[PDB]
């Protein structure tokens with residue numbers, strides 16, 4: 072009864088947009104932050120807790136899931152949604168980045184690699200990546216890509232991007248060939264081209280000619296720094312179709328997100344709130360804090376005194392400081408819940424401010440406070 | 445408005461009893477199982493989840509808390525209940541066992557020891573143990589004791605027990621001297637004497653002459669085995685005042701609990717459900733299972749198909765198998781919630797069967813199924 076994929080822009084301010092993506096398993100409010108659920112879990116959180124923070128969609132990692140527990144096994148057990156107990160949309164990455172980063176023989180067919188878990192040999196290609204994502208049952212499927220190497224010659228960046236675009240076409244065809252997947256899921260293409268404007272334009276042109284439900288900006292946050300990332304976004308996002316969502320992969324810190332929204336990004340995923348939470352870093356409106364620091368040992372205030380999350384209604388900095396220092400699982404649980412909730416509250420403030428035509432003021436006020444610490 | 449400590453026996457069957465302990469922070473249904481909350485947390489569970497499993501009271505470890513975060517610090521922050529977010533009764537052990545086990549110079553005054561965290565030197569005595577438990581704000585205070593060495597000569601067991609009894613009297617006096625503690629908390633004494641009937645009798649006589657709110661059987665589950673433990677319980681529990689609760693410290697497996705209740709024990713604590721849960725062992729009515737075992741990789745049944753816990757309503761063995769094998773925090777969370785809930789359901793079945801005069805049949809039926817596997 073619900074649409075497969077319908078993106079509606081409710082309001083704009085400059086290059087920033089806010090709206091909704093309607094899918095069969097639910098609505099995604101944009102700009103959206105996707106918690107990362109690597110191995111079929113958002114680390115340290117039950118799915119009901121993830122939803123309670125405000126998340127509309129989560130990300131799964133194809134590379135990890137294809138190795139453990141395996142895509143065929145997850146399919147036999149009813150698909151990823153049933154397996155993990157999350158009934159809302161899931162976006163899966165293609166695996167093309169982790170094979171190169173977490174594993175390796177690359178050719179036009181795909182990449183063959185050795186598993187980090189045990190050294191067993193495996194293969195990923197556009198067709199196999201799409202089939203794995205089909206078996207997982209994910210709602211948003213990412214085309215199999217290659218991250219343009221950084222730094223690299225313009226010619227190496229170009230040949231990499233061109234291969235990635237041929238892989239995008241192969242991914243489109245594989246997805247379209249599977250009727251159940253084509254009728255129930257969406258397919259996003261990934262723009263490559265490193266920091267080179269002409270290559271980003273050629274990539275965008277190729278992707279629009281193939282046609283996708285959404286367009287990701289790939290190849291960023293790979294060591295170039297925020298200033299350069301924003302410079303590339305300045306020219307790259309306008310090259311993508313305006314009427315489809317724009318997804319910045321693997322970004323980022325709160326200030327990265329705000330600046331990327333100012334440049335036309337609608338969707339984000341990042342390991343920071345979960346991973347840094349487990350390591351003792353909490354995000355607050357006055358900047359990040361390291362909760363293990365001695366200054367918090369007797370601080371009875373919550374992590375953030377304006378945060379609406381359940382953790383900040385019930386527990387102090389002093390208690391969470393103790394838990395993390397003692398290596399207690401509850402410390403990781405509470406830090407992660409707060410950090411994901413903080414990210415969702417940030418996204419809500421972004422959406423409301425764009426809707427209300429006051430996003431420029433919000434971004435200025437946010438930065439002045441977040442960086443004042 | 446509520447009583448400090450009021451124990452009522454509602455029903456008996458043989459040596460087994462069921463009833464309630466009413467305290468200012470709540471009612472404890474007996475026989476009772478106390479989850480162990482070492483470092484101001486029941487590992488991997490929020491307090492609301494602990495309560496949802498049916499627990500009425502939890503245990504804190506004085507030795508750990510006095511080292512990290514420290515008793516004075518917890519007191520400055522409002523006491524242990526506020527610090528951890530558990531508003532119901534807490535029982536604290538005395539520290540007398542862990543100093544000897546987890547750390548050491550023993551004299552009549554107390555024991556001086558080196559901390560396992562850093563080698564700093566510390567002191568525990570009856571008076572200091574009581575003061576630490578006062579600063580923590582615990583509801584049931586344990587007298588500072590010495591575990592009778594096992595094995596040991598009857599004469600060494602006797603001298604150890606006699607020292608423990610002098611320490612019990614010192615603990616009573618220190619507790620009574622602190623009006624706020626005496627008016628709001630309860631004090632339990634610990635019977636010692638190893639496996640020797642005459643020493644257990646002398647210990648019980650000494651404790652009853654001092655007078656306590658409850659009586660623990662100490663010095664068991666120290667390597668003697670279940671048959672010998674039950675033999676000692678057979679003669680030791682009847683020596684304690686019948687009209688006060690009987691607490692078996694550090695026990696145990698489900699079948700240990702059932703047999704101890706048959707011998708007159710009203711209260712238990714054990715690390716097994718939490719620690720073994722994190723390590724992949726789940727308790728079921730058909731015996732323990734090791735969820736990491738390959739046989740569970742595609743098992744869509746819950747951990748136990750008759751368990752009422754939230755985990756067994758929502759997640760499969762196959763998913764929990766995957767989580768534990770992958771080292772995921774959510775695996776520990778789900779295993780621990782189920783195991784504590786299983787222990788609470790066991791206690792509820794014990795209480796109902798005693799109340800209903802069918803505990804002997806319950807114990808027989810429980811054992812036949814649990815050991816059939």
Ligand SMILES: NC[C@H]1CC[C@H](C(=O)O)CC1
Nearest residue numbers: 168218289290292320321
């Ligand atoms: N720094 C994260 C980023 C790495 C490259 C990846 C890709 O281009 O596939 C997108 C995410």
Ligand SMILES: NC[C@H]1CC[C@H](C(=O)O)CC1
Nearest residue numbers: 541591662663665693694
């Ligand atoms: N095996 C646990 C048991 C160890 C001795 C202790 C004590 O006697 O203080 C009670 C608990």
Ligand SMILES: [Zn+2]
Nearest residue numbers: 378380383409
């Ligand atoms: Zn919060």
Ligand SMILES: [Zn+2]
Nearest residue numbers: 751753756782
């Ligand atoms: Zn269960």
